[PDB]
Paper text:
In this work, we identify the enzyme [name], which is responsible for tylosin reduction. Phylogenetic analysis indicates that [name] is the founding member of subfamily D within family 12 in the AKR superfamily. Specifically, by combining steady-state and transient kinetics, X-ray crystallography and molecular dynamics simulation, we demonstrate that [name] exhibits a positive synergy mediated by an unusual Monod-Wyman-Changeux (MWC) paradigm of allosteric regulation at low concentrations of the cofactor NADPH, but an inhibitory effect at high concentrations is observed.
Beyond that, we also obtained a binary [name] structure in complex with tylosin at 2.25 Å resolution. The overall construction of this structure is similar to the the first apo structure and all 16 subunits are in the cofactor-free state. However, the tylosin molecule is bound to each chain at the allosteric site consistent with that observed in the ternary complex structure. Intriguingly, each octamer in the structure has half dormant and half active conformation which are grouped into two tetramers, consistent with the aforementioned MWC allosteric model.
Numbering used by the authors:
A (entry chain F): 1 to 229, 249 to 331
B (entry chain D): 1 to 227, 249 to 331
C (entry chain G): 1 to 21, 28 to 52, 59 to 89, 95 to 231, 248 to 331
D (entry chain C): 1 to 21, 29 to 52, 59 to 89, 95 to 230, 247 to 331
E (entry chain E): 1 to 21, 28 to 52, 60 to 87, 96 to 230, 249 to 331
The structure:
Amino acid sequence: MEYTQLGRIGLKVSRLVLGTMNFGPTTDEAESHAIMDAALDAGINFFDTANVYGWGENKGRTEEILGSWFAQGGDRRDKVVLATKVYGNMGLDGPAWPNHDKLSALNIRRSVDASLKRLGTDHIDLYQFHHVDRDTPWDEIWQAMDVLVRQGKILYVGSSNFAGWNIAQANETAARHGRLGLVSEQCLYNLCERRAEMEVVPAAREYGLGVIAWSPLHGGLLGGAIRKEPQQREQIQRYEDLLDKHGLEPGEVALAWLLTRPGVTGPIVGPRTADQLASAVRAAELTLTDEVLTALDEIFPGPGPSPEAFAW
Amino acid sequence: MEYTQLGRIGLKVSRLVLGTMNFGPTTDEAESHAIMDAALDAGINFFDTANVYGWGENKGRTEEILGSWFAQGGDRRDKVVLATKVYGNMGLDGPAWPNHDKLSALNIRRSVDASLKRLGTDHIDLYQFHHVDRDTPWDEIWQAMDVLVRQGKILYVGSSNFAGWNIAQANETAARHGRLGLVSEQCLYNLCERRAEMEVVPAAREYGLGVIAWSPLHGGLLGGAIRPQQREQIQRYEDLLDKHGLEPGEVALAWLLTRPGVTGPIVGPRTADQLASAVRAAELTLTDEVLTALDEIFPGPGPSPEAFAW
Amino acid sequence: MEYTQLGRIGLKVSRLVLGTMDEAESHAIMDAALDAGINFFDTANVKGRTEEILGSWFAQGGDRRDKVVLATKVYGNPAWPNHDKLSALNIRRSVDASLKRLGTDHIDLYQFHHVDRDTPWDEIWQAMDVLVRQGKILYVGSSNFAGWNIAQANETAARHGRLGLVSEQCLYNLCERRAEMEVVPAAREYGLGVIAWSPLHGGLLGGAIRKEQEDPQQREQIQRYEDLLDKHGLEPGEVALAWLLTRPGVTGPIVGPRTADQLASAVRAAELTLTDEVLTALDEIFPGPGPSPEAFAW
Amino acid sequence: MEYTQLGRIGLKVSRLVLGTMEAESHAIMDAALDAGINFFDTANVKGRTEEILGSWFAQGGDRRDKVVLATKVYGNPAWPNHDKLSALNIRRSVDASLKRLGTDHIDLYQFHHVDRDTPWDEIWQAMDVLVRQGKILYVGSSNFAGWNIAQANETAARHGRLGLVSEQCLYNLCERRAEMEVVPAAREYGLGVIAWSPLHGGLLGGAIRKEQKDPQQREQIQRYEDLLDKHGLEPGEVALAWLLTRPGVTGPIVGPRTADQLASAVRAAELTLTDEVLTALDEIFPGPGPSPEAFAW
Amino acid sequence: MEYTQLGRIGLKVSRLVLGTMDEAESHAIMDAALDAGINFFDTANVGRTEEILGSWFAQGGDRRDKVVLATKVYAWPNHDKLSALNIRRSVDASLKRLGTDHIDLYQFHHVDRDTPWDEIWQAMDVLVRQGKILYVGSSNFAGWNIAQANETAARHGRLGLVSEQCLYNLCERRAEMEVVPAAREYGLGVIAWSPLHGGLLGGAIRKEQPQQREQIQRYEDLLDKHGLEPGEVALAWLLTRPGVTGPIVGPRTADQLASAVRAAELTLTDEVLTALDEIFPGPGPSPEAFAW
Ligand SMILES: CC[C@H]1OC(=O)C[C@@H](O)[C@H](C)[C@@H](O[C@@H]2O[C@H](C)[C@@H](O[C@H]3C[C@@](C)(O)[C@@H](O)[C@H](C)O3)[C@H](N(C)C)[C@H]2O)[C@@H](CC=O)C[C@@H](C)C(=O)/C=C/C(C)=C\[C@@H]1CO[C@@H]1O[C@H](C)[C@@H](O)[C@@H](OC)[C@H]1OC
Ligand SMILES: CC[C@H]1OC(=O)C[C@@H](O)[C@H](C)[C@@H](O[C@@H]2O[C@H](C)[C@@H](O[C@H]3C[C@@](C)(O)[C@@H](O)[C@H](C)O3)[C@H](N(C)C)[C@H]2O)[C@@H](CC=O)C[C@@H](C)C(=O)/C=C\C(C)=C\[C@@H]1CO[C@@H]1O[C@H](C)[C@@H](O)[C@@H](OC)[C@H]1OC
Ligand SMILES: CC[C@H]1OC(=O)C[C@@H](O)[C@H](C)[C@@H](O[C@@H]2O[C@H](C)[C@@H](O[C@H]3C[C@@](C)(O)[C@@H](O)[C@H](C)O3)[C@H](N(C)C)[C@H]2O)[C@@H](CC=O)C[C@@H](C)C(=O)/C=C\C(C)=C\[C@@H]1CO[C@@H]1O[C@H](C)[C@@H](O)[C@@H](OC)[C@H]1OC
Ligand SMILES: CC[C@H]1OC(=O)C[C@@H](O)[C@H](C)[C@@H](O[C@@H]2O[C@H](C)[C@@H](O[C@H]3C[C@@](C)(O)[C@@H](O)[C@H](C)O3)[C@H](N(C)C)[C@H]2O)[C@@H](CC=O)C[C@@H](C)C(=O)/C=C\C(C)=C\[C@@H]1CO[C@@H]1O[C@H](C)[C@@H](O)[C@@H](OC)[C@H]1OC
Ligand SMILES: CC[C@H]1OC(=O)C[C@@H](O)[C@H](C)[C@@H](O[C@@H]2O[C@H](C)[C@@H](O[C@H]3C[C@@](C)(O)[C@@H](O)[C@H](C)O3)[C@H](N(C)C)[C@H]2O)[C@@H](CC=O)C[C@@H](C)C(=O)/C=C\C(C)=C\[C@@H]1CO[C@@H]1O[C@H](C)[C@@H](O)[C@@H](OC)[C@H]1OC
């Protein structure tokens, strides 16, 4: 297992991030636990979850499954860098009661308290915004997060689905008064969707955030979606054909590709079974030749950074 | 129900603020709870109280009435933005024991501890100065408030009965050391009394404070004389509202909801009927003719310096 | 002559400020204002031509420049964009024009003519700091601000080491006391000198009814004022000025004497002691609103 | 003429920016003055253009006093430090610009492009030297990313300095990707947005009828020209007028070579587009939306 | 010619830095250095030197505009060291001797432990703000002097040291303990003075015909097996070192220039690098260098 610093900070994490969104809705508790043990066994120390995982009327269930996993002891809590999120509506799906979603200090307080109860732990290592909230100013957000820091309830703060300028504004605001800023950004990033390269990833790299790629196979579409059974199909076909030609698995290459991108800490890997985890772990050891990198780049061009992306 | 951001911050509030001053002194606990459930049903999430509500020897009773409401469960606490106040004498009415009113860190400590006990909760969402205290510096006040923020005992700080320059001084002082300053001013504003517009509301807007109008009916006066220079003015008002078939109480509220910078008025119902009426005032549109008429009868000063100079 | 600190700063000024309004006639009161010990000269009308007349005054030598605290103002007054108001652009052009007309290399107190709510204080303080570091200006003052504008301005200045506004020139007199609600409280809090403009309310407090004989309610008021002073042996124009010199935070009124007789009258106004009984009755005739928020709430 | 604040600052500008893209230049600049345009930029829609402004100002008649003068860093294989935004390159470019313009100050000095190799403490040192000498009033950007505006202005504010007051970016019906992050950031930080190539190099200027490329781009332009035929609207005027409806936009740079093109740009600033016309332009020329919603959710 | 950012700043310099050791022949070698694409001129020895540069710019032809001009500071009290007093008199004399209105890189000649940084940055900021100096650099500092200096400048918004000139070559590698780590952390370019250790790595044992001589012998003998010139290799070695901007070279002739230029084009094999590292061990970073 390859390890790296999470951006500029002192925290070392596995290049694979274990996603947990399947634990609860699709994978049962006992199997989720076996996967998490398997993940530790493979050297994966970075586990990602969210208050809202579990979905609909079972929001919170995933956090509860990690809580029962820690409760078995055996140094599980101690070995893991635990990440969860705040922003989402935790009540009935649909329009939220005011201040029961988004990033007011009010929603942060109630969300973190509920997450700590479900996770059965006194601290979260990486507390992440699920999304930018353009209505909440950073002096409010940093007040909320600093209260939790100083109480020992969280260590690090991270972002998810931010724009590049939000990352800059957050970290400049934090730095003004000596606070550690965002340490990581979780953006949608994969061969199909490369527009994070325009500004989100450049900002992250400037400010020393780790970059965590969610949906690394683009919902499945890069995992061998055509062999399984618009003009997007021609790309995918050319993709599989190129990987047939070279003997490589689609699912594994989508992950290995992300590992070659500048600034990228690693992909979120969201296995349903211990078999799919072991595949992810192979993808991490895989080495991709400069020839196959050119090919994928030709099939899946990236925008490049702004302003060059749309101007010069 | 129309919602809005409280000034520049991420908190979203109903444009009606439920005032609780009647809960205890005139409306009773059981009925107060009735009204507060109806306010939730109406989409009102913003509840305003104060330690001194109750009046006389019953000061504190409103806070307790809120406390027993939260104790019923059903996510009542979790659904409200709870706001209370510090400054007032909580002992026997008349001259205060020193440091038992006003805004010394000493009075702030003892006031918040008693409010949290009565309210039956571990935190207040919005803790408001009831009035400006010009004898207490902002480095002292913000120390006291910052202690409460970091302990998780309050989230936001607001003001009430400030001058505009007090708003600027407070928030400039907070911003110097990276603190969130005042998020709202609760000022006396209505058709009769519009001198908040000279400097209070301009200042609040510059600094991104919510503006919450208290005494939106000027203590009943804008409610009815059906039941000397000023009698004449109110007469002209009630006659205008007879012409258009509009309730006086509803227009005074809806008018404040047209003012630039105004979050909304504090509505203080004695009864569930008075509440449903406030909700109706929130739904009212006022024609440009009615707005222009009210402005003639009840002129505003406009901003300083233009208000008295040019 | 009574002298005072201009607010919190180290500059000492006369409690009479010499405002404005022939050339050698102006030079003569100015020399006379000096001999009377008035050191604080302001180009505010009680623009371009007045500066030139000060300019020719200084050009005569005799330590005239060295002896005076020279205050001027952004020119102001349908204008071409940026030829009014307080952009860094307008400030640059107004100051350079003023220095050329005043025929001096520095202005002691450079003042804003009016609040401009479209220009942020980091822009304004940039423009002023350029001039301070070049030595073209010493102190910065306001005119026709709100209390909160004074607060914003001095807080912004103080964040980066800068001296803020040292003075505010506002309309303040027996007739118009609404400066007392917030402007003068803000000024007092931040250590600004308050310079009272139109101290006689455009002449209304200088004995305008007795000068008429040679609005219903306001006339009743002036009439009750002239009669109170008749009763007390006191010149109205002098009492208007003396009243202001009793008010908390007031540096002094602007006066525009054109003769030894008018200068001597302002000087006697500054030496005048109004009795508690006079002050009590003036307060009754011309009530102030008190500070906000007590002024309109409690 | 419609006037606006340049972003958050107190400087008032016309919503048309005269891109000076000698004798026929001088003529059009006087007509722009008389039309109430006070905002003159040396951005091409550099070298000679500045000299042409300099001889304009040397004619006198309060011309320098009446204009907001904006220029740019020159830019350009370059000799080291004769391109980009080192303090060394800024000194030499401004000194040469002041010489050519025959003026002792520039009102708005702009970066020509983001330089990723120069830290903002270096850039702000260079600009603060000039501001404190009086050679420059305001600073602006061109061809920046959203995060570069944020970084610039946070760095400036930290030590009390006025940051960027304006960004010049490529923005028109055809190219709307500035809306992802550049314009959002400019709006957050209170920069004026100045739209260069507002007709996308003539292409929105009725380019298919002046024939009297890619198949899909031509299809798009065709519907545009047909929509405006239907409504009786000049395509050149509409491209400009659409930019004036966009949140955050101060205005477009125009390079009128004739009284006719000037008068046209002036009419565009007075034109009101109906909601139906706005809906239809939007359908033909869709914007990406703000990031992250533009590519995520 | 190879170019690099000077540390973290936006200034681009040649990886060879032209130092100095009559008049029209200095002028001619400077012209030749431009033609080879060297833009970085330093008055440091590898008064009169500044005057020679002055007459060079006085010829015109965009000579001043094409070069990054670096000079340095420098006993009667305050006529040495880094007092605001000596800085002022030294820079005034430099600008006159150099016949220019600005210096691109103004460098301290040595650490002065008796002057605080608030006094030094006052003096530098005055000059930066009058336009007389762009960038500030150090020479012969400790690592902690670099940290203190740049932390002090950052406090009040000011650009700190952009470069350190230290004694660094195969023979003297102790700058690697802390000076070069500090410079790397703070984003200073590292300029290697005496890159040939006074000519000891320039083929000295051949030129003549204790246990230091043993070292130089294994060096010269290794460079015979590979068909490499010692002069060139000591330069190329430094160019492979982390944090190094480049060496100060003082060519007097077109012939030595061309040697310097070749040494910047040269690529040493990992075999050669490994062998140089064996003959000339470095201490590593503190605290590992002396503890663990
Ligand atoms: C002590 C001496 C007397 O008292 C005064 O002379 C005080 C008056 O000057 C007040 C303030 C005036 O009222 C003021 O008139 C100004 C023109 C307004 O100023 C305006 C214009 C502005 C530019 O100044 C601006 O800044 C400001 C905000 O608005 C101002 N405003 C605040 C509204 C307003 O208070 C007048 C209007 C005319 O002058 C109001 C009327 C009803 C009046 O005569 C009242 C008299 C009273 C109560 C007492 C006695 C005599 O009153 C006697 O009281 C005894 C008990 C009996 O003898 C009585 O007889 C039966 C009676 O005799 C007459
Ligand atoms: C390996 C070389 C091949 O090159 C490619 O396969 C590259 C293509 O995949 C490009 C990028 C596609 O064009 C992309 O189509 C996506 C659906 C869009 O993505 C969408 C969806 C989104 C979610 O991704 C979003 O983020 C994005 C912004 O918009 C995307 N956009 C950035 C606009 C757009 O570039 C396709 C559209 C369909 O697939 C465009 C068509 C006209 C095309 O074939 C063009 C050129 C070339 C030279 C093809 C050769 C084949 O030619 C021959 O193919 C043989 C198989 C080889 O062996 C060679 O023969 C020896 C070779 O010869 C040259
Ligand atoms: C729109 C219809 C009428 O207009 C109004 O009714 C407006 C009035 O309400 C004004 C403002 C009042 O004057 C206010 O009296 C308040 C008690 C003061 O409030 C006090 C107390 C406070 C608590 O509010 C405090 O906050 C404040 C600062 O001070 C307040 N102050 C700001 C000074 C002061 O403006 C009244 C006093 C009594 O109401 C003054 C009297 C002499 C008056 O009527 C004068 C002029 C005009 C032009 C009247 C028209 C025409 O009247 C007729 O209207 C018909 C519709 C037409 O067809 C015409 O008929 C022919 C026309 O007649 C020509
Ligand atoms: C007004 C309604 C019409 O809708 C439009 O005309 C919308 C089109 O203009 C879209 C956006 C174009 O697609 C764009 O093609 C550009 C070349 C790309 O731009 C490029 C270049 C760039 C420089 O812009 C760059 O910045 C950008 C990122 O990529 C751009 N990209 C953002 C991906 C891409 O959206 C076209 C391709 C060319 O015109 C795509 C094709 C398949 C298409 O027609 C699809 C759907 C519809 C529903 C058309 C109707 C016609 O149908 C009927 O047409 C009648 C005339 C109407 O009146 C209606 O009748 C009622 C209507 O019926 C509903
Ligand atoms: C490739 C392998 C070769 O390895 C070297 O040649 C490495 C040597 O250069 C080391 C480092 C020297 O030791 C250094 O001697 C300098 C004068 C000191 O420098 C001084 C002065 C300063 C100014 O530099 C200062 O900065 C510094 C701190 O202190 C320095 N210091 C760090 C203390 C000190 O390490 C020598 C002294 C002379 O050269 C010390 C003695 C005990 C010695 O001969 C040891 C080993 C040898 C001979 C190994 C062979 C060569 O010898 C044969 O080479 C053949 C090619 C092969 O067959 C080999 O087979 C393995 C072998 O055979 C026997």
